[PDB]
Structure 1
């Protein structure tokens, strides 16, 4: 059950995908406050 089959290598892509999701959800949080009739305008 252990020690057999295969072992995962180069686990950085697992962290790269996490860094891409966290950075994308951070952008979606600022625009989330503008959703619906109760949303607010964003001055840039």
Structure 2
């Protein structure tokens, strides 16, 4: 009765993991600039 499985490639997140980490660095940048209590940046 077990069956189920349906896995095949074992790293579906590998492509979508580091991209979120790269997006989190961008997301963490606006967290410090958000709201009137936020901070500014220099480019």
TM-score with structure 1 setting the length: 0.63
Structure 2 unaligned blocks of 5 or more: none
Residue range with higher mean Cα deviation, 14-23 or 3-12: 3-12
2-structure distance, mates of 1:33, 1:24: 15
Residue range with higher mean Cα deviation, 7-16 or 24-33: 7-16
2-structure distance, mates of 1:41, 1:10: 43
| Partner SS for 1:42 | strand
Query: Structure 1 residue 10: deviation in Å?
Result: 2.9
Residue range with higher mean Cα deviation, 19-28 or 9-18: 9-18
Structure 1 unaligned blocks of 5 or more: none
TM-score with structure 2 setting the length: 0.64
